[PDB]
Ligand binder design. Structure first.
Ligand code: CLA
Ligand SMILES: CCCCCCCCCCCCCCCC(=O)OC[C@H](CO[C@@H]1O[C@H](CS(=O)(=O)O)[C@@H](O)[C@H](O)[C@H]1O)OC(=O)CCCCCCCCCCCCCCC
Ligand SMILES: CC1=C(/C=C/C(C)=C/C=C/C(C)=C/C=C/C=C(C)/C=C/C=C(C)/C=C/C2=C(C)CCCC2(C)C)C(C)(C)CCC1
Ligand SMILES: [Zn+2]
Lengths: 305, 426, 58, 61, 148
């Protein structure tokens, strides 16, 4: 519900959510290390919110709410990392994730500003007539999951090696979190920039100079991050072990590819229905979290009041 | 001449059938109307010049940093009809600019400063509201019959030639146009819609100039006479052409030709009344674009966010576009309206809110003039003896009032009419 | 620099008091733009300061 | 002004390394989030989103 | 020529012929094809603010578009038009022709229908004409049916 008011959303989901609680949680690593129960609870919360955020972001129709659940998921990733007594990985990943999500939110805001709807079901062919806002989204996508060239790969590589050295099942989430989160962005690109053009976006002029300057200037930072960690030897993942470096990329590319096939394939009805209809409208309403709140806490605190 | 039928809005139809006046016809109701026309005409007189500047000289500028500084000669650009070398000669006054607008450009609200410094310190004419309208006519497709022409095989070729001639200096842009030829081709279409809207306000600015002078002399005595002057001016200019004519270095590129047969009524007046008076893509600080909360419609036919449906008490607050015009339409106020507002609710403090309510009143008579012109063009006059020829007019008015009642998304719980008929709405 | 980097949270805290000079009930004339402009100025000056402080603590 | 009160709060949060003053600003930013989401309060789904965004984020803090 | 000279010689039609001469419909409207056409007859032009005609005459193409809308390809008579009810003109059209004793074109009434000519039937009406709106792009509710 904090997706009311665009571009604090480009800064809140990107500069507040990333370094407000995660910053407090990381600098508390010495204290949280004292009890090996807070750490396992930390792993549980992070993994649960990661899986839930990815699965819910896949089942959204509002472009502005199909990225905030991904914010929840990639902050759960930081919860996981800090759960493995790895504060350095969290401090490194915050930077890359923040850059990428800034590009993503600015591109989505640019699309919204001129294409009034936010319904994914009402936006269509924009690639041919709107390149920058599309390539920026694509680069912000690649700089979040995979493409070892782009910089978010490095910090999510050590957290595979570390989660495999100890407590392997956690890695099984981190790997899986890399395909669902890739299927969401995929269906958010293949719905806003690919496909047949629709009434609401029949005449989409590209935006003016002040909305695509930061977006393109922030699209450069993401492309230089990988090379900015080469000039100055800031090695993040010491042992290469390409056996695991070839896993994240395969997972992400597979997710994004299935996403592109389902939506750019015209081999399926476009308002896609799930074989189980009851779970589609359950991920779409975030597990009915409001009906949960108004039942457990509010309903109590109100009643006794 | 006909029986009373059923409507809850019937009290208004009996007024439309018998003369006009979509709003009541009291003298205090017309003083504010003419004052609002006089106040809305001078920023409009800058708008129609700056939009032409955008459509011809800033055709597709990646960095149109200035973009609101028309050249010295676009304030000398002869308004096609206000003076001696006029085309239909309404508004007797000078045909180059307005002394009041030139004064505001010169001194602003602080003092005689360079124009760039008048822009940084806001002190401006809030030109962003005219661009928002131009971008609101597009994306609704409501351009008229040239939108279907604005597609291919005559426009894409002319736009290609114009673009290749515009960027010929820097090969960076030229190369970009080669990769994505539809990137600057959709920005060309935008300049075309800017030109269309700027050509619509080259007609309404003289009309709103001359109506205030008619009221000053005393020829305007009731709202009926005001809307009748509006209808006569509408029919008088219904044939003027529409074109683009992008000017590049020592060259003009005929983008949409005069020989295509696009006229002012069917390509800039009717597609404008529906776009800005009716549709006007939803306010950002009044409705939630949230796709799950079915609040904003899915089809563009049910966009009830125009000036006729607007909510003018939250004016001057965050997330509400029309404020940009009411601050723009505030310092060009005649004295008999400043005195009328200063003795009222909150005095000269909330002057923007009542100044916007009066603007709503004025635009109601403008759209009523559009309704009367529409029926006089496509239907039968009021002085018709036949009964079927009078039932046709009644059906048309009932249809056009049903647009004010459709309860799809509170479209009936918006629609400021039956609220403008109230004397205590101001 | 790098010895006065603790002044960074004040630059913006100086823009959060000055930008309110332009709220619609205070100016009532020519309002809405230099607030954002001066906030951008303050943010740029606080970014330059931070970049210099980072270079100085290599 | 609210965007400037985040840029200041963010700096004060990353500079100060006391668990106590890392909560002071952490709550000031909760208040700032309440007023920032509720920017255009004439929308009935913002005054409901800003309510949750302040209460949910306040209980944790 | 044929339709032109017929409009010139016997009846008044003193402002239609000049309107056509201003446009380039003199070469057309006489080439061999029926294209039945009706005329406002100097009084439909009278029930119009004169600024209308003074602005249309200065712009040949727009007046030409209107006059093309007056022209309807094909050869039809009052019975044919009553049977059809809707007929396409040049530049496309709807032209909801109606009426029972006098054939009522969109919002006019015929005066002298079935005026034979060399290459086309000619009708005479009392309101001028104006094109539809295509509610997908222009103003919305202006296609109210005339008869029930
Ligand atoms: C060697 C130092 C160095 C520096 C300071 C830069 C910085 C720059 N590079 Mg190249 N770049 C280099 C080499 C360098 N690069 C290296 C070693 C890498 C990491 C492998 C990059 C990664 C990179 C990419 C992918 C791009 C740039 C681009 C640019 C320019 C962007 C602005 C522009 O187009 O101006 C003129 C800018 C000069 C952009 C460019 O050149 O566009 C044509 C571009 O796309 N930089
Ligand atoms: C080692 C093997 C690697 C394989 C890895 C597999 C990873 C798959 C990615 C994860 C799938 C996510 C499941 C959750 C979906 C969900 O809960 O909601 C379903 C959402 C609902 O969106 C709905 O959208 C609807 C409109 S629209 O469709 O979005 O336009 C709207 O009505 C509705 O409200 C909205 O919620 O829609 C979907 O995304 C459905 C996705 C399921 C499609 C999978 C089919 C498999 C195809 C076979 C592969 C083809 C071969 C190609 C080879 C390259
Ligand atoms: C407006 C627009 C456009 C265009 C735009 C553009 C073209 C932009 C560009 C942009 C750009 C072009 C950007 C760039 C950027 C870059 C960057 C941002 C960089 C950075 C770098 C860095 C940061 C580096 C670093 C380093 C090095 C390398 C050296 C030393 C240091 C180290 C690291 C440390 C057009 C026409 C389409 C139209 C529409 C829109
Ligand atoms: Zn400016």
């Amino acid at each position: 519900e904090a997706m009311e008011g665009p571009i604090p959303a480009s800064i809140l989901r990107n500069a507040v959510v990333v370094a407000t609680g995660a910053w407090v949680l990381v600098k508390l690593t010495p204290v949280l290390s004292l009890s090996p129960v807070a750490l396992t609870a930390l792993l549980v919360i992070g993994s649960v919110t990661a899986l839930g955020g990815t699965l819910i972001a896949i089942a959204q129709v509002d472009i502005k709410r199909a990225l905030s659940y991904l914010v929840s998921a990639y902050m759960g990733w930081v919860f996981i990392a800090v759960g493995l007594k790895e504060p350095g990985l969290a401090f490194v990943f915050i930077l890359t994730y923040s850059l990428a999500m800034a590009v993503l939110m600015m591109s989505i805001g640019s699309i919204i500003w001129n294409s009034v709807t936010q319904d994914l079901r009402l936006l269509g062919g924009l690639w041919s007539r709107r390149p920058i806002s599309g390539i920026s989204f694509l680069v912000g996508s690649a700089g979040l999951l995979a493409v070892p060239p782009l910089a978010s790969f490095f910090p999510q590589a050590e957290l595979l090696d570390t989660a495999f050295a100890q407590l392997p099942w956690v890695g099984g989430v981190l790997l899986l979190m890399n395909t669902f989160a890739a299927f969401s962005l995929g269906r958010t690109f293949c719905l806003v920039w690919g496909g047949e053009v629709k009434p609401m976006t029949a005449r989409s002029p590209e935006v003016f100079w002040p909305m695509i300057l930061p977006m393109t200037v922030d699209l450069g930072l993401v492309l230089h991050l990988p090379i900015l960690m080469a000039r100055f030897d800031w090695v993040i993942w010491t042992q290469p072990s390409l056996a695991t470096a070839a896993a994240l990329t395969i997972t992400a590319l597979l997710g994004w590819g299935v996403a592109a096939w389902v939506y750019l394939g015209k081999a399926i009805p476009k308002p896609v229905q799930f074989p189980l209809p009851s779970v589609q409208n359950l991920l779409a309403y975030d597990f009915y979290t409001p009906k949960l709140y108004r039942a457990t806490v509010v309903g109590v605190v109100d009643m006794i009041s | 001449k006909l029986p009373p039928l059923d409507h809850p809005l019937a009290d208004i139809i009996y007024r439309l059938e018998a003369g006009g006046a979509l709003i009541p016809d009291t003298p205090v109701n017309l003083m504010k109307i003419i004052g609002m026309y006089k106040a809305y005409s001078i920023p409009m007189d800058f708008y129609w010049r700056d939009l032409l500047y955008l459509g011809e000289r800033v055709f597709i500028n990646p960095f149109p940093f200035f973009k609101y500084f028309p050249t010295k000669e676009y304030f000398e650009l002869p308004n096609h009809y206000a003076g001696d070398t006029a085309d239909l000669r309404i508004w007797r006054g000078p045909a180059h600019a307005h002394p009041e607008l030139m004064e505001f450009i010169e001194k602003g609200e602080t003092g005689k400063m360079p124009r760039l410094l008048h822009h940084l310190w806001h002190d401006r004419i809030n030109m962003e509201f005219s661009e928002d309208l131009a971008r609101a006519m597009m994306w609704h497709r409501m351009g008229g019959q040239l939108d279907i022409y604005l597609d291919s095989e005559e426009y894409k070729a002319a736009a290609d030639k114009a673009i290749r001639a515009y960027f010929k200096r820097n090969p960076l842009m030229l190369g970009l146009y080669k990769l994505f030829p539809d990137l600057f081709l959709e920005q060309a279409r935008q300049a075309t819609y800017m030109n269309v809207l700027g050509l619509f306000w080259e007609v309404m600015a003289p009309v709103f100039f001359e109506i205030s002078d008619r009221y000053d002399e005393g020829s305007i005595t009731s709202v009926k006479d005001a809307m009748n002057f509006l209808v006569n001016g509408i029919f008088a200019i219904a044939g003027r052409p529409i074109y683009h004519h992008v000017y590049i270095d020592d060259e003009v590129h005929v983008l949409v030709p005069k020989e295509k047969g696009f006229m002012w009524l069917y390509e800039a007046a009717f597609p404008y009344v529906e776009a800005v008076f009716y549709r006007t893509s939803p306010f950002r600080g009044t409705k939630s674009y949230n796709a799950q909360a079915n609040q904003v419609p899915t089809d563009q036919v049910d966009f009830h966010y125009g000036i006729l449906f607007a909510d003018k008490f939250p004016v001057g607050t965050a997330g509400i576009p029309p404020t940009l015009l009411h601050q723009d339409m505030y310092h060009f106020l005649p004295q008999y309206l400043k005195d009328y507002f200063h003795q009222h609710c909150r005095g000269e403090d909330d002057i923007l809110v009542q100044l916007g309510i009066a603007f709503q009143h004025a635009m109601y008579t403008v759209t009523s003039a559009v309704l009367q012109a529409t029926r006089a063009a496509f239907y039968y006059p009021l002085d018709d003896p036949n009964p079927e020829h009078l039932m046709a007019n009644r059906r048309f008015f009932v249809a056009q009032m049903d647009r004010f009642l459709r309860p799809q998304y509170g479209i009936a719980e918006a629609c400021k009419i039956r609220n403008v008929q109230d004397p205590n709405y101001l | 620099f790098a010895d006065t980097v603790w002044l960074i949270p004040f630059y913006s805290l100086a823009g959060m008091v000055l930008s309110l000079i332009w709220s619609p009930g205070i100016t009532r004339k020519t309002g809405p733009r230099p607030a954002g402009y001066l906030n951008i100025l303050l943010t740029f000056f606080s970014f330059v300061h931070a970049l210099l402080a980072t270079v100085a603590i290599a | 002004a609210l965007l400037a009160l985040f840029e200041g709060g963010m700096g004060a949060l990353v500079l100060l390394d006391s668990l106590f003053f890392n909560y002071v600003v952490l709550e000031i930013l909760t208040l700032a989030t309440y007023l920032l989401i509720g920017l255009w309060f004439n929308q009935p789904l913002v005054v409901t989103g800003a309510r949750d965004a302040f209460l949910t984020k306040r209980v944790g803090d | 020529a044929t339709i032109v000279d017929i409009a010139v010689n016997t009846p008044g039609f003193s402002t239609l012929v000049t309107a056509v001469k201003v446009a380039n419909l003199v070469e057309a409207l006489q080439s061999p094809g029926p294209f039945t056409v009706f005329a406002p007859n100097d009084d439909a032009f009278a029930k119009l603010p004169d600024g209308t005609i003074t602005s249309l005459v200065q712009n040949p193409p727009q007046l030409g578009r209107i006059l093309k809308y007056h022209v309807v390809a094909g050869a039809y008579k009052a019975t044919d038009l009553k049977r059809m009810g809707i007929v396409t003109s040049l530049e496309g059209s709807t032209i909801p022709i109606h009426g029972d004793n006098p054939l009522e074109v969109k919002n006019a009434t015929v005066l002298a229908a079935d005026i034979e000519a060399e290459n086309g039937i000619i009708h005479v009406i009392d309101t001028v004409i104006l094109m539809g709106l295509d509610p997908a792009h222009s103003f919305q509710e202006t296609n109210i049916p005339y008869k029930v």
